[PDB]
Design a binder for these strands. Structure first.
Ligand SMILES: [Mg+2]
Ligand SMILES: [Mg+2]
Ligand SMILES: [Mg+2]
Ligand SMILES: [Mg+2]
Ligand SMILES: [Mg+2]
Ligand SMILES: [Mg+2]
Ligand SMILES: [Mg+2]
Ligand SMILES: [Mg+2]
Ligand SMILES: [Mg+2]
Ligand SMILES: [Mg+2]
Ligand SMILES: [Mg+2]
Ligand SMILES: [Mg+2]
Ligand SMILES: [Mg+2]
Ligand SMILES: [Mg+2]
Ligand SMILES: [Mg+2]
Ligand SMILES: [Mg+2]
Ligand SMILES: [Mg+2]
Ligand SMILES: [Mg+2]
Ligand SMILES: [Mg+2]
Ligand SMILES: [Mg+2]
Ligand SMILES: [Mg+2]
Ligand SMILES: [Mg+2]
Ligand SMILES: [Mg+2]
Ligand SMILES: [Mg+2]
Ligand SMILES: [Mg+2]
Ligand SMILES: [Mg+2]
Ligand SMILES: [Mg+2]
Ligand SMILES: [Mg+2]
Ligand SMILES: [Mg+2]
Ligand SMILES: [Zn+2]
Lengths: 23, 81, 60, 114, 95, 155, 125, 96
RNA sequence: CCGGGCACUCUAACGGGACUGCCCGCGAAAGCGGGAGGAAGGAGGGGACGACGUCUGGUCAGCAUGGCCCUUACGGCCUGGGCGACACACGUGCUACAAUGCCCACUACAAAGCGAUGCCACCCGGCAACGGGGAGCUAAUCGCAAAAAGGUGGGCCCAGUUCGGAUUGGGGUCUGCAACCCGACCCCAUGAAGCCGGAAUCGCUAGUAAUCGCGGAUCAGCCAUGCCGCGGUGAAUACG
């Protein structure tokens, strides 16, 4: 999961926001 | 990549919009791989630097949004073994 | 290419991208600290010498 | 066949089942169950072919698609391998594109090793 | 597999397969030689050949040193052989 | 443990049955520190241990533990040129530890989809003498026995 | 009216008010049950009250900050324990040997350089 | 409010007692020295000139703040404090 | 939040407390076992500190320095390339192969830090990255900030899958003079290997391993999954 940009947990690891982990 | 502006050096830009004006020639030598191929370039032979050599690329409307460097590649490979 | 190098980082050239910290003592580009003006080596020598104001071996 | 570019996905939920098409991801999927008001939880099995014909028709006419796409797609590579291109000349060698290291890894683009 | 490091020296495919060939002597013992690593190196006196190898029964480490590079390598294998026969026979004192 | 004896920690008894043996178990269910998780499993199973086979989940648990603890085990010494599997009794310490361990381990190999069910069922069967754990016990114990004649090399 | 003690475990501080009553407990402005839902360790740091056989004797007003839910509990532990022993300090006996007061000093260890997680060392040849 | 900064806390706190307890006589009501949370700057550095990345010594920099309040100013507390015994470094602040 | 107060919590400076000092037991003594009180006992836990020396260890490329060598060149400036090449081989690591799990939506509880051509509240455009406006803060008084795992209730139903997110197509954003070679991020589509790993082999004895997120240096940006720190939840076992 942590590697999958399209998911919450994805973005959290990556330290970014987007549609799948919004601000 | 590169959002609003269209990047050509305004050094080879000048050179292409002159040669087109009076009686269009070829053989423009440049070291700018960073330059976009802008539709005013479409057809020509420009000599592009990969760093040991100036490699000539015929321009065609096939390729425009690209960079002049993409067509004169920097590495000589040929294989392994 | 060495002492000429330390000079080249002094006067600030064509583009501001080309800005890189060197250090004052040694001409070291690598592991320069902004706050000190120092490399990690030079920094150490001085700290230990007691020449760096309020700077102390940490220990927690 | 079933639907769309002729996959068939029975027996699971529709938002998922649609993914099983080329071009249709979890994203494009949720779209068309909105635009047709078909309820994503309903499993394909209970369709009402009325809904199904509606579902087929939007998706089929809206984007492109099974066998297309990959035709249209591949055409870019055949273009990019045609033009110059570098990133073109890299498809020509079956080598990686986007600037990854070739010294190690790169196995997905190179296949198993020998 | 087998790796060779020529350190501060310009080595060759031919001498590389020579060291591969000299190391082959340890195949005699019929025991797995795991990721062997030789290092060839100059020195003012003469060359230096090191190798470090692990096997199911332990690890081999040794240095050859000599004027001729080839006699250094031989010396290295000579020292390695001993170590290998010892790992192989050591507890047979099982009385 | 070169030096002295290695203390056996005691353990906070649990907040449902007030019994150390349960937390040790919950500890053995635990994975990556997530203890709350490790709890619900045991208790959820305890729901199931009552639900099916109406009884006292405490009782069932504490029964299947005694139904697991191995009385005798092999621990192998090198003598001369051969390694002898040697018969030796397990400490009550070690039996608990081997009890809980095989229990869980065998639990997690069951075909049941939900973890607590796996825990539920494995315990119910071990109470009765059936299962992966119990086998491992009887197994270990037949592997002792048959070595009875190496009981002299015993420490 | 009131009874006080200060609990702490692991970068967490609990202020406990032992004010006498039904046994309702409030933590940071809501009952124990709302603030710790789920977690089973929550059953509880109230254990000090069941220690001196008073169950309902007191209510509790409690603020708690620092750390995380479990850490917070163990602080409440030396809280309701420190508060109750204050109330009638014949209360040390049977609270103390029951290991109720005496806040545990166990905390996180510094990460050390050259190691990874402060003990776990990196892999070698 | 008069804010005090600087590195040595022994030097500082000496002159937090100087300034505060100065204006106790020459003024009032002198709200006592209040220590602020100290701002730590750590530097971790690789001990040697060369490789050896697993050997390092930590170096920190302790910059601590104190605030002191004098209730009623009593101007000429604005004189008796218009100089004072320093020491050699520290940061003085004053505002209303 | 105002009044009001320093009791709290805290903050950060100075003190106290642990001594085998007291009881039993043994000893010739040192000291070992056991007990009491105590927040803490037998070095309370972690740090800083690391002998004469060893490896003819390491670094002339941080710096210094003897000696040898080059002086329209082994010096100096620049544009561009390269340091990222890829048949292969090893070392350190990331993410995983799933149900003690994955996804959505709502809802909690830290610590240490860092911020002026910086940290950006909040409002608006945008699915979004971002872009507009725009307040506060020389910062315990503003901001990064959301902590995450957890809690709740809903979906998934054993499927190479709602596991895993590699690879590639296309469309955008930002830094920067410039993102061909070579940046990071965002969105759409693509969804590889991988079903728990041979010989072999590493770490860790308790707030430790495991697992979960957060900060910082360096820094335009960033290839950080690295490093140095920080708390959250929190085991197993040690006969020998
Ligand atoms: Mg996924
Ligand atoms: Mg994970
Ligand atoms: Mg730079
Ligand atoms: Mg589409
Ligand atoms: Mg890349
Ligand atoms: Mg930690
Ligand atoms: Mg440390
Ligand atoms: Mg390392
Ligand atoms: Mg090493
Ligand atoms: Mg006070
Ligand atoms: Mg010492
Ligand atoms: Mg040497
Ligand atoms: Mg030098
Ligand atoms: Mg250059
Ligand atoms: Mg490199
Ligand atoms: Mg490999
Ligand atoms: Mg890595
Ligand atoms: Mg403020
Ligand atoms: Mg597949
Ligand atoms: Mg999938
Ligand atoms: Mg990608
Ligand atoms: Mg693309
Ligand atoms: Mg396959
Ligand atoms: Mg499967
Ligand atoms: Mg494994
Ligand atoms: Mg795993
Ligand atoms: Mg130890
Ligand atoms: Mg950065
Ligand atoms: Mg980070
Ligand atoms: Zn320097």
């Amino acid at each position: 999961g942590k590697g999958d940009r399209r998911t919450r947990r994805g973005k959290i690891w990556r330290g970014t926001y987007g549609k799948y982990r919004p601000r | 990549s590169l959002k609003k502006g269209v990047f050509v050096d305004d050094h080879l830009l000048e050179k292409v919009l002159e040669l087109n004006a009076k009686g269009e020639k070829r053989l423009i030598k440049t070291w700018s791989r960073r330059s976009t191929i802008v539709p005013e370039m479409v057809g020509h032979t420009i000599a592009v630097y990969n760093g040991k050599q100036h490699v000539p690329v015929y321009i065609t409307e096939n390729m425009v949004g690209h960079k002049l460097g993409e067509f004169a590649p920097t590495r000589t490979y040929r294989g392994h073994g | 290419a060495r002492k000429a190098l330390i000079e080249k980082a002094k006067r600030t050239p064509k583009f501001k991208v080309r800005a890189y910290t060197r250090c004052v003592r040694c001409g070291r580009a690598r592991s320069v600290y902004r706050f000190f003006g120092l490399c990690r080596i030079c920094l150490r020598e001085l700290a230990h010498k007691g020449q760096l104001p309020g700077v102390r071996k940490a220990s927690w | 066949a079933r639907i769309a570019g002729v996959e068939i996905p029975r027996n699971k939920r529709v938002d998922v089942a649609l993914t099983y098409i080329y071009g249709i991801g979890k994203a494009r999927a949720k779209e068309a169950l909105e635009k047709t008001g078909i309820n994503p939880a309903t499993r394909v099995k209970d369709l009402t072919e009325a809904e199904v014909v509606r579902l087929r028709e939007y998706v089929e006419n809206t984007w492109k698609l099974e066998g297309e796409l990959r035709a249209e797609v591949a055409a870019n590579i055949k273009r990019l391998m045609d033009i110059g291109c570098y990133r073109g000349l890299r498809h020509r060698r079956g080598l990686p594109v986007r600037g990854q290291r070739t010294r190690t890894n790169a196995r997905t683009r190179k296949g198993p090793r020998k | 597999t087998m790796n060779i490091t020529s350190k501060q020296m310009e080595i060759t495919p031919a001498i590389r397969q020579h060291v591969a060939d000299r190391l082959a002597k340890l195949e005699k013992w019929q025991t797995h030689l795991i990721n062997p690593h030789i290092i060839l190196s100059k020195e003012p006196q003469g060359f230096v050949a090191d190798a470090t190898i692990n096997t199911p029964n332990g690890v081999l480490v040794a240095s050859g040193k000599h004027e001729d590079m080839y006699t250094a390598i031989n010396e290295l294998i000579n020292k390695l052989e001993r170590q290998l026969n010892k790992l192989q026979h050591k507890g047979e004192a099982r009385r | 443990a070169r030096r002295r004896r290695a203390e056996v920690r005691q353990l906070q008894p649990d907040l449902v049955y007030g019994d150390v043996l349960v937390t040790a178990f919950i500890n053995k269910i635990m994975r990556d520190g997530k203890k709350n998780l490790a709890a619900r499993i045991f208790y959820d199973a305890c729901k199931i241990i009552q639900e099916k086979t109406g009884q006292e989940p405490l009782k069932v648990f504490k029964q299947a533990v005694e139904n697991v603890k191995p009385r005798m085990e092999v621990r192998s010494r090198r003598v001369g040129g051969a390694n002898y599997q040697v018969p030796m009794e397990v400490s009550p310490r070690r039996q608990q530890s081997l009890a809980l361990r095989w229990l869980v381990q065998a639990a997690n190999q069951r075909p049941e989809r939900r973890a607590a069910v796996r825990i539920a069922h494995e315990l119910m069967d071990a109470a009765e003498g059936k299962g992966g754990a119990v086998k491992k016990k009887e197994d270990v114990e037949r592997m002792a026995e048959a070595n009875r004649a190496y009981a002299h090399y015993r420490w | 009216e009131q009874y006080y003690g200060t609990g702490r475990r692991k970068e967490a501080v609990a202020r406990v008010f032992l004010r006498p009553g039904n046994g309702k407990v409030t933590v940071n402005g809501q009952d124990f049950n709302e603030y710790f839902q789920g977690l089973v360790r929550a059953v509880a740091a109230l254990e000090p009250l069941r220690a001196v056989d008073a169950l309902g004797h007191f209510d509790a007003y409690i603020t708690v900050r620092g750390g995380g839910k479990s850490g917070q509990i163990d602080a409440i532990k030396l809280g309701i324990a420190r508060a109750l022993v204050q109330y009638n300090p014949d209360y040390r006996a049977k609270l103390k040997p029951l290991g109720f007061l005496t806040r545990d000093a166990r905390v996180v260890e510094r990460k050390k350089y050259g190691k990874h997680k402060a003990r776990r060392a990196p892999q070698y040849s | 409010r008069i804010k005090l900064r600087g590195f040595d806390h022994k030097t500082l706190d000496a002159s937090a007692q100087k300034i505060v307890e100065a204006a106790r006589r020459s003024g009032a009501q002198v709200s006592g020295p209040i220590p602020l949370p100290t701002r730590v700057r750590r530097f971790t550095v690789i001990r040697g000139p060369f490789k050896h990345k697993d050997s390092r010594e930590h170096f920190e920099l302790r910059t601590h703040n104190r605030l002191v309040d004098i209730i009623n100013p009593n101007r000429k507390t604005i004189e008796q404090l218009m100089t004072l015994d320093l020491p050699t470094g520290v940061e003085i602040e004053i505002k209303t």
